[PDB]
């Protein structure tokens, strides 16, 4: 599924992301835009043998188990395929672990690069929320 | 829903898989799996080459 901007904002707010760990809803929408272009099925392999999964491109070295990532942890305690669902529940629950683990939303390279320090409220303007 | 005309969620097989249960499917690398149902986080149902049933999700890559 490719989410609409406002559609995703409503779903993320429904799942408790607005101001989660102090990050306004626009941060989360923005991170999904530049991680996956809002596509729940995005899957990108890395040269270290890990892979990034789903709408927030969560990585298989620390966070989820894909069976093929050597010396990996599974700190969200889920198969990475869980992050490829059309509803965002599993990506949101995992995202809450990641953003709470000490580096806040800096865990998401596209958020650091494209969202941090921009007017992220733009990502929610015009949405009924 | 599942009854639509389109092929729904599709994937390509990355590795061989041999069905290991009465309710499973087999495929070869590069086979296409269509009409995927994400019934469980780890094992999914789908249709591959005229056969319907269960397969490990991490043996396929969603297109795209």
């Amino acid at each position: 599924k490719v989410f609409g901007r406002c559609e995703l904002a409503a779903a993320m707010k429904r799942h408790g992301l607005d101001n989660y760990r102090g990050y306004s809803l626009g941060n989360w929408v923005c991170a999904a835009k530049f991680e996956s272009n809002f596509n729940t099925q995005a899957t990108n392999r890395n040269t270290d043998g890990s892979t990034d999964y789903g709408i927030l491109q969560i990585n298989s070295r620390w966070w989820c188990n894909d069976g093929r990532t050597p010396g990996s942890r599974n700190l969200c305690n889920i198969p990475c395929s869980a992050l490829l669902s059309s509803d965002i529940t599993a990506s949101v629950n995992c995202a809450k672990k990641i953003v709470s683990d000490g580096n806040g939303m800096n865990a998401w390279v596209a958020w650091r690069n494209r969202c941090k320090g921009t007017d992220v409220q733009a990502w929610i303007r015009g949405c009924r929320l | 829903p599942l009854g639509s005309s389109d092929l729904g969620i599709t994937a390509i097989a990355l590795y061989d898989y041999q069905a290991a249960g009465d309710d499973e499917i087999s495929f070869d690398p590069d086979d296409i799996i269509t009409n995927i149902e994400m019934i469980d986080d780890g094992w999914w149902r789908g249709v591959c080459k005229g056969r319907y049933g269960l397969f490990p999700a991490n043996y396929v890559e969603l297109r795209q």
Partner: peptide, 13 residues
């Protein structure tokens, strides 16, 4: 070069 994966855990419940 490339890893064939371990099978995911048997379906939950």
């Amino acid at each position: 070069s490339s890893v064939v994966p371990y099978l995911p855990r048997l379906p939950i419940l």
